[PDB]
Amino acid sequence: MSEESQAFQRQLTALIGYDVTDVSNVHDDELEFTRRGLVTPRMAEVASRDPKLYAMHPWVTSKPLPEYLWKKIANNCIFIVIHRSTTSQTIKVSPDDTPGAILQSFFTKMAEQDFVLRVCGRDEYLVGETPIKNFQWVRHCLKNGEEIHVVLDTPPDPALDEVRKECDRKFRVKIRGIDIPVLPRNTDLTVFVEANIQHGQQVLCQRRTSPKPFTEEVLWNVWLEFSIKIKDLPKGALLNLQIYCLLYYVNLLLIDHRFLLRRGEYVLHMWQISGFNADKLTSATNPDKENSMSISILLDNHPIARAEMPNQLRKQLEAIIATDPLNPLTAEDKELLWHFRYESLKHPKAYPKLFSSVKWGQQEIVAKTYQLLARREVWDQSALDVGLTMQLLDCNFSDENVRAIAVQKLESLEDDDVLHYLLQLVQAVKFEPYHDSALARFLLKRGLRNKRIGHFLFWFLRSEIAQSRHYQQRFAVILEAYLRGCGTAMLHDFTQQVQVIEMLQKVTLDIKSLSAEKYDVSSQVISQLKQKLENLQNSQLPESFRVPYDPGLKAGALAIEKCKVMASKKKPLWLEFKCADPTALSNETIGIIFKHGDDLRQDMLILQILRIMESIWETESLDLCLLPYGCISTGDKIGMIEIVKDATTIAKIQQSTVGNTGFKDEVLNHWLKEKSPTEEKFQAAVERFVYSCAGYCVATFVLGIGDRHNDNIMITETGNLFHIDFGHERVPFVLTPDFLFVMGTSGKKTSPHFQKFQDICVKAYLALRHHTNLLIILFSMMLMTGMPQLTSKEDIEYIRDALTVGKNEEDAKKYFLDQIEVCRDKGWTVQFNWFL
Numbered sequence: 001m002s003e004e005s006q007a008f009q010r011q012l013t014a015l016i017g018y019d020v021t022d023v024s025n026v027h028d029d030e031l032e033f034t035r036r037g038l039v040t041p042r043m044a045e046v047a048s049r050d051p052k053l054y055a056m057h058p059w060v061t062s063k064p065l066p067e068y069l070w071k072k073i074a075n076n077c078i079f080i081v082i083h084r085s086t087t088s089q090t091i092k093v094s095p096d097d098t099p100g101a102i103l104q105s106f107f108t109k110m111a112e113q114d115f116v117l118r119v120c121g122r123d124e125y126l127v128g129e130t131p132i133k134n135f136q137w138v139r140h141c142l143k144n145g146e147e148i149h150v151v152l153d154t155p156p157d158p159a160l161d162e163v164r165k166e167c168d169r170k171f172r173v174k175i176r177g178i179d180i181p182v183l184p185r186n187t188d189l190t191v192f193v194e195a196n197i198q199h200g201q202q203v204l205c206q207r208r209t210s211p212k213p214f215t216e217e218v219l220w221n222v223w224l225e226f227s228i229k230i231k232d233l234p235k236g237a238l239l240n241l242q243i244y245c246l247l248y249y250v251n252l253l254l255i256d257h258r259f260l261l262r263r264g265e266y267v268l269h270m271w272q273i274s275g276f277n278a279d280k281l282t283s284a285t286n287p288d289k290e291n292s293m294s295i296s297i298l299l300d301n302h303p304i305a306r307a308e309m310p311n312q313l314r315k316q317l318e319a320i321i322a323t324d325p326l327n328p329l330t331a332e333d334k335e336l337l338w339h340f341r342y343e344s345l346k347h348p349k350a351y352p353k354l355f356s357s358v359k360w361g362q363q364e365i366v367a368k369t370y371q372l373l374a375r376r377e378v379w380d381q382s383a384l385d386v387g388l389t390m391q392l393l394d395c396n397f398s399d400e401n402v403r404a405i406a407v408q409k410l411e412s413l414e415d416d417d418v419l420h421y422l423l424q425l426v427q428a429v430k431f432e433p434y435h436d437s438a439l440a441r442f443l444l445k446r447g448l449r450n451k452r453i454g455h456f457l458f459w460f461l462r463s464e465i466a467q468s469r470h471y472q473q474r475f476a477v478i479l480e481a482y483l484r485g486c487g488t489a490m491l492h493d494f495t496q497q498v499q500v501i502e503m504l505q506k507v508t509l510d511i512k513s514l515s516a517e518k519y520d521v522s523s524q525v526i527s528q529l530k531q532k533l534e535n536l537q538n539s540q541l542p543e544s545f546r547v548p549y550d551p552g553l554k555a556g557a558l559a560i561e562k563c564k565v566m567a568s569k570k571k572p573l574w575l576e577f578k579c580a581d582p583t584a585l586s587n588e589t590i591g592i593i594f595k596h597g598d599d600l601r602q603d604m605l606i607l608q609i610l611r612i613m614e615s616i617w618e619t620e621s622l623d624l625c626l627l628p629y630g631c632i633s634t635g636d637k638i639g640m641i642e643i644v645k646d647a648t649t650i651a652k653i654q655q656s657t658v659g660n661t662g663f664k665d666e667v668l669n670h671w672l673k674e675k676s677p678t679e680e681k682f683q684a685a686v687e688r689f690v691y692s693c694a695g696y697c698v699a700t701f702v703l704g705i706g707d708r709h710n711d712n713i714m715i716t717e718t719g720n721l722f723h724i725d726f727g728h729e730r731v732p733f734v735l736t737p738d739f740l741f742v743m744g745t746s747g748k749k750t751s752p753h754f755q756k757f758q759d760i761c762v763k764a765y766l767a768l769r770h771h772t773n774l775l776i777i778l779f780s781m782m783l784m785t786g787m788p789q790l791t792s793k794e795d796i797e798y799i800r801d802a803l804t805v806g807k808n809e810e811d812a813k814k815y816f817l818d819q820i821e822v823c824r825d826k827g828w829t830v831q832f833n834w835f836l
């Protein structure tokens with residue numbers, strides 16, 4: 001259209017990180033169809049949201065207030081400090097009051113009501129017809145022991161969020177030939193092409209070409225006639241073409257987004273495997289048209305146009321539903337689930353095991369399944385089970401409707417719940433066969449309904465866009481169809497944020513280069529760090545930006561003097577920022593780490609599960625003092641990390657008292673007391689230590705990341721312990737004698753805190769077991785979309801053994817107590833070993 005419209009699209013391109021208008025790496029118009037197909041659901045959400053409520057984004061939870069927070073409010077009183085420049089009073093509030101109602105007990109109490117309640121030093125607001133007990137910031141203050149300092153000011157202008165105006169024949173495939181520029185290697189070996197029909201990873205039919213010597217060009221021109229008929233092709237079928245010696249792979253949809261059968265000449269560029277993951281399921285081809293392996297294929301063959309169970313049989317089926325998500329279905333089991341479709345339907349938790357039993361390569365069977373889906377009585381009115389819903393969104397299911405019934409359950413999730421699972425759901429898009437889908441349209445809508453959900457969504461999409469060449473095609477389209485609806489308010493914010501993170505990443509890679517691999521850190525690289533920051537703080541670094549992992553915090557100027565580089569193998573950047581928000585309570589500068597080398601996506605996923613792991617314990621009234629710091633991956637092996645103030649590494653405390661590489665059990669307790677100003681805060685630090693050393697000890701054990709080096713765990717000056725750097729004899733978890741010495745026990749004995757330690761650990765361990773399916777599915781998704789080439793059995797299976805699936809709570813209690821004992825015997829053996 002207009003020239004200004006070109007600049008708007010040019011503005012979006014830089015914000016996404018990928019050119020959406022690009023049509024060089026595509027053989028069809030699935031991107032453009034999806035791009036225009038998302039215009040309706042975007043405007044159907046933009047023109048549907050409340051302009052005022054969206055501007056203020058009041059983050060609220062609807063879950064009941066837990067028992068470990070009612071103890072602080074053992075008086076039915078809340079002390080709010082309403083700031084107003086040089087004026088601040090303390091109005092006593094009841095734990096069941098309304099933002100509008102508490103204003104009335106202020107204006108009349110002091111002595112015009114067009115003002116707003118806003119957090120001091122943050123962009124968080126307290127408004128809406130919701131009890132003050134339901135605000136997450138209020139509950140945050142009650143957890144750590146803080147006072148809710150609010151400020152009286154004018155509500156943000158809702159006009160700033162202005163969105164700018166807008167056959168029965170058997171299927172066959174002709175494998176013509178392959179082409180590759182460079183091949184030279186060691187000894188010669190044979191090579192062939194394997195064609196497969198995929199629908200949820202399971203192969204419906206397999207054909208194979210004749211083995212030939214691996215040369216820079218091999219031609220077959222042979223038809224591979226599959227046994228499956230053209231009419232028996234299910235919606236979202238994949239033509240999996242793979243070159244074995246496996247070296248190259250590429251996928252192509254047998255049925256397009258238009259329901260039409262794909263036909264014509266196709267030359268695809270295949271991805272290379274490093275000498276399973278979602279990257280093997282992608283529909284997009286390799287943009288590196290030069291160095292990648294080519295493959296020419298031809299297609300020319302539109303479509304899609306009572307009896308109650310006996311006692312012993314139903315008891316056999318009930319056992320199949322009771323089994324874990326990672327339990328294989330026998331040909332005997334596969335038939336039982338299907339034959340009794342109607343009785344199997346009456347169990348929400350049986351759907352994943354039901355649809356896996358469905359043979360999708362049959363016209364009639366598929367047709368009967370849709371008839372089964374038409375009568376979703378129990379499923380629709382059932383209580384929302386998240387882990388169950390997630391199961392129907394993984395790789396195992398590719399049917400558009402089977403995945404659609406899951407998204408329906410996600411609709412009932414509120415904003416707070418979306419924030420917990422946002423990373424995984426955005427990651428779950430990889431398992432989708434098509435670009436436009438119910439799940440994709442869902443995340444878009446929720447991101448447009450909430451500024452906070454949208455903020456993380458932006459960085460969650462942008463993470464995969466920058467580095468994952470497999471799915472960046474899809475994610476970029478989803479991001480564009482969000483930026484066109486988030487409003488100019490956030491569009492400005494993202495431009496500020498993108499400029500900052502890109503400028504500093506360039507500095508990160510420059511400084512990391514100007515030094516060797518060996519740790520040293522000289523005044524040279526320190527002065528070079530100082531020099532580059534001086535040029536940025538000028539007319540380069542924008543006045544103030546929003547912290548990507550903490551949207552409420554608005555960081556601005558740099559504390560250049562407090563910046564340095566760590567004396568480690570991979571050189572990062574310790575950075576501190578001045579809070580541009582002047583209504584703040586302290587001079588506390590915001591700490592940010594820019595690190596290259598480690599894959600932050602993996603660290604990002606672990607932290608998210610930990611954030612979910614807290615809510616699991618929260619529902620059962622348990623606090624485990626988990627401290628999942630902010631972390632968002634922005635590019636390849638490079639991203640952003642939060643700094644926890646007053647936190648020191650347990651290993652460094654050993655370096656501060658004993659030798660540099662050469663361990664005293666007493667050191668830890670001495671460090672806590674000297675940093676403690678009073679005796680009480682020390683007792684609070686000792687108690688907090690138990691909780692945090694109980695939270696991570698359980699969490700890190702389940703996820704299989706328990707065996708960590710001494711430097712990989714850090715502790716605050718207030719006793720809060722937490723693991724760091726989730727890059728990727730043995731010990732279940734880290735619990736060395738120096739940790740025990742603080743609790744009172746030394747060298748296998750018993751103390752009042754160690755009994756409490758075991759009490760909390762057990763009560764936390766079985767509490768997770770009551771969510772077995774939710775944790776397992778997130779674990780399986782984590783490895784497939786975050787980690788590299790995982791084991792399709794061994795790696796996923798680990799968590800089943802760790803959660804002791806099968807045995808009762810009493811055997812489980814004993815099992816976990818046994819795992820502690822394994823750490824009681826080794827002591828320092830493992831930590832001393834950590835060198836190889």
Ligand SMILES: O=C(Cc1nc(N2CCOCC2)cc(=O)[nH]1)Nc1ccccc1
Pocket residue numbers: 564565566567568572573574593629641642643644645647724725726
């Ligand atoms: O690299 C680390 C160790 C580390 N620290 C992390 N942060 C430290 C601050 O608290 C949150 C976790 C995360 C992480 O993954 N690894 N620390 C560091 C690096 C450069 C300069 C100064 C300190």
